[PDB]
Amino acid sequence: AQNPNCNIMIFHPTKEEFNDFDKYIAYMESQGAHRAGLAKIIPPKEWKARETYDNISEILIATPLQQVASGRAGVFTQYHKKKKAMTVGEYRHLANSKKYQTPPHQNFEDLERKYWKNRIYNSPIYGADISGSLFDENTKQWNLGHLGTIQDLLEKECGVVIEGVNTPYLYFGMWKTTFAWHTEDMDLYSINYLHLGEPKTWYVVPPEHGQRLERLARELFPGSSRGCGAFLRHKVALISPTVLKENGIPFNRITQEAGEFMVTFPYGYHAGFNHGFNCAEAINFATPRWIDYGKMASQCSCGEARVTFSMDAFVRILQPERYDLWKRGQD
């Protein structure tokens, strides 16, 4: 069995290996990369996502989200308070202001310490989930707006033709902006490219141990657990590495820098934070190996998780027993 300790693997494809996306994903899995839940892919030196970022400040963040925390430093939830629209230029200036800027630090480890110590005492503003792409249309390799669609994959594997579309999303971050513990919708893969700026630290639980994290989360967030049998789908709960280690939960960590891709694998729980002003692009995708995870994915039916149009068909075809209850949650 490849990668039996479920370590995060880092890949350095050549320019030739970077041509066929699906083939490279399947290669990484042949080496056991999925067992970690997360892999890093460093593009060949000849590749670029676009020519420059000199012209992005006019993008609009229509609904910036202020991430307000409740709890204790290692075990907290966050809620998103909607703020007035601002441009990326405005948001960058805000990120760099004395109130929001990254503090002086020695290295990534010192910064990680500071994040876990102090996160809850601040409310950083995240420009998340913005439909769009920063890949040049002429970038032919690993262009996250030109991937094969999940609808087409389900059609190829299962023969059924369904409605829905699959487009990328931009994320503008600042110091302390946080992504809560989650798997993807329908336990899909994700791919995330850090276009520019400061790093992003990731934490991940191997898919084979995801239920250990869920059981801890039910213990740590007992009201939430009574409200919903899949409350991590609400994407609000944080648990620190120290707390994970105290409770024997297997996990790994890695820091993504600008110019790097990360892939999350089906049912790989992940969480993390941004080091400073940055911009990432991400999208969900599927492979044939996903289909069995899609069929078994938990679902939030309490009404909180509220998701895209395209998840309807995935539930309807892969989980017909659950469909009626899940759709009641959506409506």
Ligand X SMILES: O=C(O)CNC(=O)C(=O)O
* Residue 68 touching Zn ion (CB under 5 A): no
DSSP notation for 169-219:
EEEEE-TT-EEEEEPPGGG-EEEEEEEEES-EEEEE--GGGHHHHHHHHHH
By CB under 6 A, name the one of 141, 192, 287, 301 that touches ligand X.
192
Q: Which two tokens stand for residue 322?
A: 């659950």
**Do the annotations mark residue 146 as ligand-binding?**
no
* Residue 264 touching ligand X (CB under 6 A): yes
**Do the annotations mark residue 48 as ligand-binding?**
no
DSSP notation for 43-71:
PPTT--S-S-STT-TT-EESS-EEEEEEE
| Residue 58 interface partner, choices Mg ion, Ni ion, ligand X, none, CB cut-off 5-8 Å depending on type | Mg ion
Query: CB of 222 within 8 A of CB of 209?
Result: no
* Residue 58 touching Mg ion (CB under 5 A): yes
**Do the annotations mark residue 278 as ligand-binding?**
no
Q: Which stretch binds Zn ion (CB under 5 A): 26-34, 60-68, 256-264, 303-311?
A: 303-311
Nearer to ligand X, 106 or 199 (CB): 199
CB of 264 to ligand X, least distance (A): 5
Cβ burial of 320 (10 Å; 0-12, 13-18, 19+) is exposed
What's the CA gap between 240 and 237, in Å, rounded?
Answer: 10
CB of 172 to Mg ion, least distance (A): 12
Query: CB of 282 within 8 A of CB of 184?
Result: no
By CB under 6 A, name the one of 280, 300, 305, 318 that touches ligand X.
280
By CB under 5 A, name the one of 65, 86, 286, 300 that touches Zn ion.
300
Nearer to ligand X, 139 or 192 (CB): 192
* Residue 54 touching Mg ion (CB under 5 A): no
CB of 304 to Zn ion, least distance (A): 4
What's the CA gap between 293 and 298, in Å, rounded?
Answer: 10
**Do the annotations mark residue 126 as ligand-binding?**
yes
Nearer to Ni ion, 92 or 133 (CB): 133
Q: State the DSSP H helix or E strand holding residue 324, giving kind and residue range, or none if neither.
A: helix 320-330
Half-sphere exposure of 307 (CA within 13 A, CB side): 23
Q: Which two tokens stand for residue 212?
A: 């250990």
* Residue 190 touching ligand X (CB under 6 A): yes
* Residue 307 touching Zn ion (CB under 5 A): no
What's the CA gap between 230 and 301, in Å, rounded?
Answer: 8
What's the CA gap between 164 and 308, in Å, rounded?
Answer: 9
CB of 300 to Zn ion, least distance (A): 3
What's the CA gap between 205 and 212, in Å, rounded?
Answer: 9
* Interaction site with Ni ion (CB under 5 A): 190
Q: Which residues bind Zn ion (CB under 5 A)?
A: 228, 300, 302, 304
Binding residues for Zn(2+), by number, are 228, 234, 300, 302
Binding residues, by number, are 126, 182, 184, 192, 200, 228, 234-235, 270, 300, 302
Q: Which residues bind ligand X (CB under 6 A)?
A: 171, 179, 190, 192, 264, 270, 280, 282
